[PDB]
Amino acid sequence: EELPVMPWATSVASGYTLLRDPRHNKGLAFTERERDAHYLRGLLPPAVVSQELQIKKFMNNLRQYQLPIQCYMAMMNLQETDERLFYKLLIENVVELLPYVYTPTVGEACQKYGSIFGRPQGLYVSLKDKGRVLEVLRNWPHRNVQVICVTDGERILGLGDLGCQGMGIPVGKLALYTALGGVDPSACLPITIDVGTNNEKLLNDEFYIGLRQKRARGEEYDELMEEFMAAVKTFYGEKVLIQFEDFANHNAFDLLEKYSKTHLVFNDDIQGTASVVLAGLLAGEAGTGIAELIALEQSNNAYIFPGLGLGLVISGAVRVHEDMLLAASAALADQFPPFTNIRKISAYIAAAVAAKAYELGLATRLPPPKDLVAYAESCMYSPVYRNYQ
Amino acid sequence: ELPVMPWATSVASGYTLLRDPRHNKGLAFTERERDAHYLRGLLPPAVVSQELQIKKFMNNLRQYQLPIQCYMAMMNLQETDERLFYKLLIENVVELLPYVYTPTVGEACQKYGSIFGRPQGLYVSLKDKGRVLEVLRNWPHRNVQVICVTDGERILGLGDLGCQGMGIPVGKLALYTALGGVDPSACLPITIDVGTNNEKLLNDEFYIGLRQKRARGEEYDELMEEFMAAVKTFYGEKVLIQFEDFANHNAFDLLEKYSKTHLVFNDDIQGTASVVLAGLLAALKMVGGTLAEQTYLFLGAGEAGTGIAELIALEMSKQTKAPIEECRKKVWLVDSKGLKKPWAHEHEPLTTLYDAVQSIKPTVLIGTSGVGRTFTKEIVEAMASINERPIIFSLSNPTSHSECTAEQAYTWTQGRAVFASGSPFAPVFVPGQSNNAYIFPGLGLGLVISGAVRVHEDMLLAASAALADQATEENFVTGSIFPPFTNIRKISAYIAAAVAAKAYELGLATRLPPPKDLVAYAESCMYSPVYRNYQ
Amino acid sequence: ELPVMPWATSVASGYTLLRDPRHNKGLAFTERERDAHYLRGLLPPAVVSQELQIKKFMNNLRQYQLPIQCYMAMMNLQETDERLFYKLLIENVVELLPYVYTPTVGEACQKYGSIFGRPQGLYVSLKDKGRVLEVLRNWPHRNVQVICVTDGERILGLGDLGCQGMGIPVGKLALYTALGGVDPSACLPITIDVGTNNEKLLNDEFYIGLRQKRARGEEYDELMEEFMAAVKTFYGEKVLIQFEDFANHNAFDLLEKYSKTHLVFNDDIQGTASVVLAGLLAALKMVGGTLAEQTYLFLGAGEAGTGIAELIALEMSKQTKAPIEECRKKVWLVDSKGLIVDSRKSSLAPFKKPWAHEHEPLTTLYDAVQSIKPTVLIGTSGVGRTFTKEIVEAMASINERPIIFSLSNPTSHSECTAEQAYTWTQGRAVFASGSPFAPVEYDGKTFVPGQSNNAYIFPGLGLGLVISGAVRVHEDMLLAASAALADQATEENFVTGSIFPPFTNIRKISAYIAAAVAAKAYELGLATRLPPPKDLVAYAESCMYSPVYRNYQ
Amino acid sequence: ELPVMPWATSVASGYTLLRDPRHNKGLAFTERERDAHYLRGLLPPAVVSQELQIKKFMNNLRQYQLPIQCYMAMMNLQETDERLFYKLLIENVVELLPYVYTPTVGEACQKYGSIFGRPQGLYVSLKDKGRVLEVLRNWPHRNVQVICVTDGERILGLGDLGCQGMGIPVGKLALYTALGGVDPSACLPITIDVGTNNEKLLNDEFYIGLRQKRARGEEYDELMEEFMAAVKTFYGEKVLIQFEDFANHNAFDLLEKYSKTHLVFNDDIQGTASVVLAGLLAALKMVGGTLAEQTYLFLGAGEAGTGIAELIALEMSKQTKAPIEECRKKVWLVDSKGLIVDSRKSSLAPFKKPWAHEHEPLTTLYDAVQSIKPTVLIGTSGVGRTFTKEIVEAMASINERPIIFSLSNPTSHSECTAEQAYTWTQGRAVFASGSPFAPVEYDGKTFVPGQSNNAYIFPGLGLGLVISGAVRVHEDMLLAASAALADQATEENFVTGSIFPPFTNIRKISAYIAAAVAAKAYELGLATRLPPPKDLVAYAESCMYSPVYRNYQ
């Protein structure tokens, strides 16, 4: 078409290019044959160390950090250096690590985001990108995005407006879509929309990473959000999931009402909460969201969103329907069970969500497979290291 | 005839640029650099200066409870934003030296397998026999100037740490860059893995080396010969090979052999001799007297022990104009068996150090035993009884292995001792650290900038005299014989100029003709870690 | 469990961008693109349009004295600026087809080693046994849609050219892209090298293949089985495997076996059948008559001869509702031993047996023409000048408008020329050839003989399978393609003597063929791209690769 | 403070390796190299040596009908496999010099836009004012040793070809590599585009330059000053800047100005004087006599005529220890108005005045020959057939062995042919020409007249400057190069009539010239690679780039 394209060059990763790619880096788990074939001989010490031994070593060091924020920083650095090791470690130690990678330590990470800023994660779209949102998306090196987790940072947990530093939440949430729901991490895209912040402490902080101005509202905000949602559809198509999160309530409801008619969209604070509380049973975002779903039919949202996201992706759903939330709740209640078997739980939720998408005529991956549970499991990302040619 | 690696070059942009520690500026990339290199959106909107990034990193680093955690964060920084790492290190050298170098670097080697993070340096093992050149070809920097090589057999006073000895050459080269201005892209840390005799490491599931006992004799010699031939073939005649943390017999044999055919330096032998001699020249400028009027007694007669003693005798002969054999008579050493061959003078056989202190009556006492608490209250009180201002050097590293602490040296002598240590000590009197990092960066720079092809003993004398010339009344009043590390870049420039002048004078320099102002020339050659602006 | 290749991605700039034929625009990079991708100074100041670059290339190409030199310049262009190559090919298709396809491509295969330039395609040899999957992993495009594979044993009528047979699939795929709109990044030309029986090539110091005689039997079978299993493992169930230039027994065996397990077709058998049936339907629309009323006589009874005869009998059975066995009765073929007859049955190759009707033996084509009195004569012999003056005059005595197809390639192998067909029939023959012939001036008229080029069918058939997500080729898709092409042949081309529409409107023709093939895939329950779009012609067009330059960020 | 380009390095493999002309070996990659660099399957099975690739290339090249087609194939090879290009060029230098260099390179400049293929060199235009350093940063080789630059105002005898003048520095640098052993990665061809006064090019839709008239004065000066400052800033004090194909006055001004601040050579001015002086020293070695004993007469008193005359007078002053003014006394020149004499001084261009000796005015060359009775006659007029039968016969009457140099280029402009020189002197002329003539059969002998090709001198001169780390060019280095080239002319070439040794041994010749130039740099205190090696010939040879393929890890 007429729109500009990024010219991408592809080559075999070897040497430090391979060691510095978190998607391909195995660290000391590269075998002697892989080291010889990819020009790593001498760049690594002689020992070949399995994924399991690397997990053990990482957990031993992590437990020696005095502060939870230091465990969070070591986890983010791991995610951005050896992705497969990060996901396998997270899956195997989910109960111990969820408080570090997610709530509550992820909230403290957003408060201190500027001061602890390390390896770059996610994509930032600000007011300075007006008229250029598509151009910003073209810098993202993964073409086939399936799940976007987006925030404007206005309502981070119970911590309020954390502006551009709200990025820690979509980054944390997507790690859970991968670890708990098996969504491929290369298909995940955390986004922060920076329209300024009303947080005076952050506006005075020399380490703040966002636009140093008060929060845009009304038409200026609306125009950027409309350009963003149009750019996401133009570039990623009709099937991309846009998961809104940690937006202020009036905005969260307006965004959900508007974009749920034109895109595949859901708001975990409104809909995920309503779904998990209903599954449990069997006046804001949560209060009215839950009340509505009750009338229609640990309370952690991570029991529902990973399986729900997986169910939408595997069915090629183009819209989220309230009946999918009812199906996700019934599937969870049929299984609260612990987070130790979250992958099996997510497969059952994904199969129930996918079945509803087919029944409502909202699925595009046609015809539906006969066993949706086995199909969901076959689609789940496995963080076991690959063997290299 | 030899195979070559086909390298492809392209403009770094996007994540390729962000993941290259040599070019990554993090949030310091300007809006124009972000637009030009496809970073827009990959980074949050703020542009954050190198100075703000230093402040942020130091704030976080000070919150780590353990020194090893500070070391780990420093290694990760070196391997993510190297300019930031070097600028931070230079500006906070006094605070950070104990974390990036001695003593924490020793603990890093002990735990190296368990804390393994980003890959650093090059490993050459017994499995690479007949393929050493092929291994060097994998190193992505063609113009190597300084190689720091070890086999991990003598790590500080911690003994055999095998392949885990890599932490020392990695730390040493960070100091050649930060303190001496050697370009980091021209630095190559190497560990030679021939196995280890450390049974705990051989049993450790996290050990990173060959899980075998050390090779010795012909098998070892053949690998070392192939390694030294490969280094000359690939990097030429002017590459500096700095040997470090080798066991004593091996260290002396390697130095004797390769100093005739390559530009080589053994920091444990020669760097130590140079820094201690400078310390002695400075101490004599603070307390009075000459080198010839002194009586020397060493505890430990290995690399450091005989290394220092040999240079003391050399400087004494240049001043007195007398033969070196005569200058050796007033220098004594005590090994594990009691009171290497040029030092065995005619004397009654004594076993304990205390009995040697009473019989010899030294004015200078130097500890290089690698054994802790060997300088007892009795020995230090005897030194204070024999001399008005006894000169005591307790050099054994790490801190637990030190012969005595600074607190002990000043308390037992009633504040009369002239103290210097190998380990970093807190003020009591500001104890001087007889740190080799005062000499090797400037010495290394001096050899590189002059295009020296051989190290000569007179360059060690020139390096010692230039460091002593930097020790003024400003540091003497505090009780420190050495100038502080705060002005290490200026000190290194003076050392480099003195070493380069010596190379030209001896006909060993190849960068001809010599520049007129060698100090200004050394400074102009020093790597600056200020961020570059990008096209 | 299987090993994977670790691929690294980065923004192409400078010489990396200039040396990538997929992104290189040469002097068409704008000043803004040059600034953004570090090209400023690497190129002279002028910005030169794709249209000006086409003109400049065509000017230079017309100055080469030898057709092989035009072919070499075309291959070098394909491997330096592929968008320019495809746009130039589409715009100058009539002029360039003889250089990039038959006949020049036959000469290119004969001289392939001596003219070897930029690497094209993938070679899988006997030395790759047990490592075929590893070889496929070196191919830098993961989502392959169309594979054109050869072992080079039957190149045109030239026989065995071994590893140098690679010129054919490379040429065919450029036509799937230029004429059918298949994305070139989704095309994969493959040569399977099992050696060659060509003694001249084995003695040639410039030969590029294994310097051995052809492997046969078990060793060959095991490599082919490993190859077909590797293609399915790596590219999935929907990849199209188009077999080409295989010798006849092998071609029929490969087609019978792999058509049950993969999406396959053999262009020499099925593609030829489909274009020739379209030509016959067009000839009958031009001159009147039905398929059933005809009497057919073929010279040559191999891949093309029997493949075409089968599709004629099949189309006839659909039109008449009669059994296919009854429809084969007025179809006759002459091989190297003479007329194929019932008395010869025991010694015939199986593909010949359905055509062995009861009849006295006849040893020459002339005798077969006089005894059988065909209304349609088709040459697929590989032997030039076999449609003699006497044979063509007998056709013109037997028929008011004899239908004569001289399909053997390259040109020197044609059974007769267009000049001969029109002169020898006093301008009454309905003529078509495999080789391009110039217009013929006869009496006061100009005759433009149609070329029964497989490229009229395979690009659209390939696109139709891809866009519908077809998992199997069905014979009814070949009939749908033939009917779609014949529907494009009108009075506009008939008035000039051409039974085919010209290649100038090939993109539109391929869209109609693709839509008819895709409709057939949906109707037969063989399509996986569900649901079918309502307008399959508009859908086919929307899927076609456009070689217009992109604008770069 | 200045911005830097962030460069990323990685191991080349697959198509990245095949598309890099510096590393690409084509079919010469061994099976082990193919396995190690992910090429298995990307190439056909045969491993074909560098020698076989040279043979294959030469076979194809000889089949092109047009010389420009040979040139295009050569440029495409240079930009696909440079080691193959250089090894082929070295081995076939006599045959290929007329295609890669003069005269075909001039035709290439005239048609540069219409034949534009793979990008070569760097373009700096008026649009780059204030950004010249930024343009140099896009060049992917950091350690440039030799820059060949033009503004294309005077290409051979073809005039102003503007931006299309790039073909000359590209050709000249291929010769610094092939003939002199300068590493090609250290060579940088540059065209400065300030517009063109060529109306045919400004009207040509395929012109590649700024479509404007040529800038002059301050605008031109400011770009040239920024360019020369950028070259020093980025490449240092030791980079060689070789000016070429500039108009006479501009070339003079640029050489006078930048010779004081940079390492600067103008091949047209300085290389020409050096090669003709070498021819004269060799002619005198062949037939006997000294420079001082000769009487010189030139037809043409321009850049070449006066440049050569000055270098002859300079060498004569060194040999005799006499002032150069005394050495100019037996050197005479005839311009378009006749003999340059003292009485004409008021109307002469200042550069002609040192040659205006006292003498009666003479209007024809014939009268000048009869009156002056030269022993040496040199044609630098640009006017063909001005060395008439009468003139050549008079030279043979005056001298037993007349030395006749007909240096005007191309052969159509030559003052006389080799056939004419030998016939008109009964085989007694010592003849050389600027352009090649075929051997001459006269009496029972074969005469091979030598050519005053600048390519004999500049490769070795450039190498001599590079290897010694010279910071300035001195006129004595030109004398050392001439003496070194003449020393290579032996009885082996004299017996055939050639005063120059053949180009077949050019690598050895260049090593001797390089050693003599380097020795001169050390002697004059202009060399920085200190101390000088003891054997400068062996040192020059050890520095020469060898185009034999590397083995890959």
Automatic annotation (TrEMBL), chain B:
**Short name of one Pfam family for this protein?**
malic
- Secretion signal: which residues? none
Q: Which CDD domains match?
A: NAD_bind_1_malic_enz
Reaction(s) catalysed by this chain's protein: oxaloacetate + H(+) = pyruvate + CO2
Q: Which Gene3D superfamilies match?
A: Malic enzyme, N-terminal domain (3.40.50.10380), NAD(P)-binding Rossmann-like Domain (3.40.50.720)
Binding note for cofactor: Divalent metal cations. Prefers magnesium or manganese.
Q: Which residues are the active-site ones? A: 101 (proton donor), 172 (proton acceptor)
The record lists (S)-malate as bound by 154, 397, 435
**Where is pyruvate bound in this sequence?**
154, 172, 397
Report the cofactors.
Mg(2+); Mn(2+)
Record-annotated residues binding NADP(+)?
A: 154, 248, 301, 303-304, 336-338, 340, 395, 397, 434
Q: Which residues form the Malic enzyme N-terminal domain?
A: 78-259
Q: Which residues bind a divalent metal cation?
A: 244-245, 268
Residues in Malic enzyme NAD-binding domain copies: 269-504
Functional pathway = Photosynthesis; C4 acid pathway
Give one GO term, molecular function aspect.
metal ion binding
An example Gene Ontology cellular component term from the record?
chloroplast
For this UniProt record, the keywords arranged alphabetically read as follows: Metal-binding, NADP, Nucleotide-binding, Oxidoreductase
What's a GO biological-process term for it?
A: malate metabolic process
Q: Which NCBIfam families match?
A: PRK13529.1
Q: How does it assemble?
A: Homotetramer.
- Which family, according to UniProt? Belongs to the malic enzymes family.
Name-wise, this protein is Malic enzyme
